[PDB]
Amino acid sequence: TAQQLKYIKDSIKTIPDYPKAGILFRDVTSLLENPKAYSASIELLSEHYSESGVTKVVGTEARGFLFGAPVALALGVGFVPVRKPGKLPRETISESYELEYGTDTLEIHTDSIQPGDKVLVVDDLLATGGTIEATVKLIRRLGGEVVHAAFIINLPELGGEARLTQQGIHCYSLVSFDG
Amino acid sequence: TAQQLKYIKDSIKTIPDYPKAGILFRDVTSLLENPKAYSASIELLSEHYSESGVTKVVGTEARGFLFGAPVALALGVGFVPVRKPGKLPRETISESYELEYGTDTLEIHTDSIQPGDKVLVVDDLLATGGTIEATVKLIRRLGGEVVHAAFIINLPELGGEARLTQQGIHCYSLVSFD
Ligand SMILES: O=P(O)(O)OC[C@H]1O[C@H](OP(=O)(O)OP(=O)(O)O)[C@H](O)[C@@H]1O
Ligand SMILES: O=P(O)(O)OC[C@H]1O[C@H](OP(=O)(O)OP(=O)(O)O)[C@H](O)[C@@H]1O
Ligand SMILES: [Mg+2]
Ligand SMILES: [Mg+2]
Numbered sequence A: 001t002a003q004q005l006k007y008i009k010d011s012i013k014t015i016p017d018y019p020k021a022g023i024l025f026r027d028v029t030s031l032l033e034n035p036k037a038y039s040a041s042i043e044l045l046s047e048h049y050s051e052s053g054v055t056k057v058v059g060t061e062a063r064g065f066l067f068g069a070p071v072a073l074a075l076g077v078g079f080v081p082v083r084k085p086g087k088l089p090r091e092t093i094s095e096s097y098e099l100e101y102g103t104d105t106l107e108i109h110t111d112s113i114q115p116g117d118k119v120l121v122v123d124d125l126l127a128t129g130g131t132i133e134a135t136v137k138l139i140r141r142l143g144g145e146v147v148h149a150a151f152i153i154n155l156p157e158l159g160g161e162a163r164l165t166q167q168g169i170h171c172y173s174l175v176s177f178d179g
Numbered sequence B: 001t002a003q004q005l006k007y008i009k010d011s012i013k014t015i016p017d018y019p020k021a022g023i024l025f026r027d028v029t030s031l032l033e034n035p036k037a038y039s040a041s042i043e044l045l046s047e048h049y050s051e052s053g054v055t056k057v058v059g060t061e062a063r064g065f066l067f068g069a070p071v072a073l074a075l076g077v078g079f080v081p082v083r084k085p086g087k088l089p090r091e092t093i094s095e096s097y098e099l100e101y102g103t104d105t106l107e108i109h110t111d112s113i114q115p116g117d118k119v120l121v122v123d124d125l126l127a128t129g130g131t132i133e134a135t136v137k138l139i140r141r142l143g144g145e146v147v148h149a150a151f152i153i154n155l156p157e158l159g160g161e162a163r164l165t166q167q168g169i170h171c172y173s174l175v176s177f178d
């Protein structure tokens, strides 16, 4: 099983000086194009929550779609996107979050979460945690419970794991990197 | 399976007056939230291409990610995203195309397609075909072969099916609204 976590971690490329000089980017697209690593990653996430009682999966636009939706399929429960603004056609609510250079919002359909839903949030990557903190507020405003957030990659030095742990969320990541 | 296509079709909500007055929007998110409809749509798409010899699946950001990637996982081939600009970190090429109110681009990683790749394109929705024509140009510039494009929903009145058929693309759509 280490076999597998190892094959998943090796499949992810590290790009130097991206997005800027000095900084490393962990590129999930190289996992996406290795069908062994990709299927293993969805198999691990879905087996870990198999007995969790989750009734909805939420995945945040856009890379989170590529993990949240296969997990939802493997679990046999509904998938609910949280999207960038102006894309969801039915009635929505919104939360604002901080980017490096200003602020943006995420939206969810109000009809798609309801009281008593047990919601697993899935994203490719956990860094500062701003994205998921916003997503978790969307879900809780509609009466969903979130106690679990799952990721392919964690960069615990950026603080997101500690930040989400403090907000009642058990973070589960397949691999992690540091400097 | 008629039974199944009807279940998929009825799972998709029609939204009146979106994005504006007079216009109808087919909302695939109601399908995503019905696990039976969702898994069935992925089952039909992957089984249709099971013997096609496909080596890569491309899905265009963002809604195509929701159908191209599960299709890739079912075929057991790699998935390659085509993205909005500035999101892909390795070397890319780019293709410009028309929106209603101006011009945008789609990018692809140059290392993710090679000569002799056999590439299925998957998207949620075929309307005018603009998006997919651009996508296809990305793939072909890298030596990739594309002869199939697949969709959940086709809106043939908007001309995309015919447009793409003209470009050597065989279009396969689960359902149609008219
Ligand atoms: O934990 P945080 O610091 O919020 O960072 C993690 C988030 O950032 C990235 O998304 P991004 O908005 O760059 O783009 P994408 O998902 O559209 O590719 C990644 O996909 C996570 O959603
Ligand atoms: O056949 P065409 O006329 O090009 O239209 C079809 C495309 O338009 C929509 O994309 P959009 O950029 O609104 O957003 P999304 O995929 O990010 O939701 C849809 O998902 C298809 O990609
Ligand atoms: Mg993201
Ligand atoms: Mg699209």
Ligand code: NA
Pocket (backbone or CB within 6 Å): A110, A111, A112, A113, A114, A115, A142
């Ligand atoms: Na609700």
Ligand code: NA
Pocket (backbone or CB within 6 Å): B110, B111, B112, B113, B114, B115, B142
């Ligand atoms: Na190439």
